[PDB]
Amino acid sequence: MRGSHHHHHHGSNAKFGLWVDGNCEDIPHVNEFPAIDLFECNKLVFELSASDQPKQYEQHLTDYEKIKEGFKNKNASMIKSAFLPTGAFKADRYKSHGKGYNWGNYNTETQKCEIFNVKPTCLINNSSYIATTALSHPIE
């Protein structure tokens, strides 16, 4: 036999809608990826180059100097109980986006991955892996 767990709720591949009215009344469109079959959301270059540089992304040399202020907040100490505020100060997580070949989010529901871009101000995302081997890829 070859089947999985069935369901009848709302989501992306299952349905196409959103939660009750709020601040973002619309519906984004990210590319899903069955990482369970291959590995993760790392391979994706069929139609993403078009959105590789939407705005001025050539003068980002001043974005690396903020690498030392990545912990300017305090989540590093509230880890054991850090209420992930991925909405109010979501723009504070300015990691090394310049060296993040990965631009997708991960949803823990059944077994699927999402990859496309970052949301402006909505509530249909959860995990987000941007860090990637910018050059060296040792075991560490």
Report yes or no on 1 lying in a domain: no
Q: Are 62 and 98 in contact (CB under 8 A)?
A: no
Q: Find the CATH number of the domain harbouring 88.
A: 3.50.4.10
Query: What are the CA-CA distances from residue 22 to residues 87, 95, 121, 122 (Å)?
Result: 13, 28, 11, 9
Report yes or no on 14 lying in a domain: no
Q: Which amino acid is at 99?
A: K
Report yes or no on 21 lying in a domain: no
Q: Are 126 and 108 in contact (CB under 8 A)?
A: yes
Report yes or no on 90 lying in a domain: yes
Report yes or no on 100 lying in a domain: yes
For the chain, give the DSSP string: --------S-SSSS----PSSSS--S---PEEE-TTTSSSTT---SS-GGGS-SS--S--GGGTGGGGGTTSSSHHHHGGG-----STTGGG----GGG----EEEETTTTEEEES---SS-S-----B----SS-----
> Using the 8-state DSSP alphabet, how is residue 28 labeled?
-
Tell me the residue length of the chain: 140
Report yes or no on 135 lying in a domain: no
Query: What are the CA-CA distances from residue 1 to residues 4, 7, 43, 62 (Å)?
Result: 10, 18, 30, 56
Report yes or no on 55 lying in a domain: yes
Report yes or no on 103 lying in a domain: yes
Which residue's structure tokens are 């560490």? Answer: 140
Tokens of 30: 């990210």
Query: How far is it, in rounded angstroms, from Cα 138 to Cα 140?
Result: 6
Q: Coil, strand or helix: which one is 17?
A: coil
Q: Coil, strand or helix: which one is 31?
A: strand
Domain that residue 86 falls in: 30-130
Count how many domains the chain has. 1
User: Which residues in the chain belong to E strands, given as ranges?
Assistant: 31-33, 104-107, 112-115
